[PDB]
C-alpha cells in the first residue's frame, strides 16, 4: 500500500507513466485498437497474449514483470444508457480487484468509455465517479491520465473537492 494513498491527474501519454502497473482501455477482442489501446500495444505488445475478455471485466497480462490490466468499458453506441452505466461501473470494480491482488503501491488509469466508446457524449464526470467508487477502498496511489487541457482542469478540481 502507499503510505498516504492519493489521487493525482497528469496530461500525457499513459505509455510514459511512472506507476507500478497500467490499466489499458481495451477492446473485448484483445486487438491493438486505437487511442490509449494502440499506445499500450506499442509499449507492451507482449501483454496482448490472451488478453480478450468480456465487457465489464478486467484481465491482467504481464509484460515481463510489469502488469497490464486490460479493462473493457462499454461502447455507448451499442449499450443503452442504463446497461452501459452498469457495465462501466463493473469494469472499474474489476480493476480495483486486480490492483489489490497484484499488491502494487501505484496504478496509472485512463477514464474508460470517454473516447470512441462515449457514443458522442461527454462522460468525464460519469466515468471519473465510477473510478472513485471502485478505487476509494484501495490503498494504491492512483494517477489518472488524460490528453485534453480542459479535462485536466476538471479532473484536478474533482480530486481537490474531496480533500
Ligand atoms: N496514449 C494515450 O494515452 C492516448 C492516446 N489517445 N488517447 C485518447 C484520446 O486522447 C489517449
Ligand atoms: Cl506525452
Ligand atoms: Cl482527455
From Swiss-Prot:
Binding positions for ADP-D-ribose per the UniProt entry: 13, 27, 35, 115-117
Segments passing through the bilayer: none
Post-translational modification: Phosphorylated by host on serines and threonines.
Outcome after substituting residue 117 to V/W: Almost complete loss of mono-ADP-ribosylhydrolase activity
Impact when changing residue 27 to A: Partial loss of mono-ADP-ribosylhydrolase activity; complete loss of ADP-ribose 1'' phosphate phosphatase activity
Effect of residue 13 to A: Partial loss of ADP-ribose 1'' phosphate phosphatase activity
Membrane topology: Peripheral membrane protein
Top-level lineage group: Viruses
Location relative to the cell: Host cytoplasmic vesicle membrane
Effect of residue 36 to A: Partial loss of mono-ADP-ribosylhydrolase activity
Segments forming domain Macro: 4-163
Domain notes: In the N-terminus, the macro domain displays a mono-ADP-ribosylhydrolase activity. The central part called, the alphavirus unique domain (AUD) has a zinc-binding function. The C-terminus region, also called hypervariable domain (HVD), is mainly disordered and binds several host proteins. This intrinsically disordered domain contains 2 SH3 domain-binding sites and 2 FGDF motifs necessary and sufficient for the formation of nsP3/G3BP complexes.
Subunit relationships: Interacts with mRNA-capping enzyme nsP1. Interacts (via C-terminus) with host G3BP1; this interaction inhibits the formation of host stress granules on viral mRNAs and the nsp3-G3BP1 complexes bind viral RNAs and probably orchestrate the assembly of viral replication complexes. Interacts (via C-terminus) with host G3BP2; this interaction inhibits the formation of host stress granules on viral mRNAs and the nsp3-G3BP2 complexes bind viral RNAs and probably orchestrate the assembly of viral replication complexes. Interacts (via C-terminus) with host NAP1L1.
Described function: Seems to be essential for minus-strand RNAs and subgenomic 26S mRNAs synthesis. Displays mono-ADP-ribosylhydrolase activity. ADP-ribosylation is a post-translational modification that controls various processes of the host cell and the virus probably needs to revert it for optimal viral replication. Binds proteins of G3BP family and sequesters them into the viral RNA replication complexes thereby inhibiting the formation of host stress granules on viral mRNAs.
Protein name per Swiss-Prot or TrEMBL: Non-structural protein 3
Covered residues, full protein: 1334 to 1493 of 2474
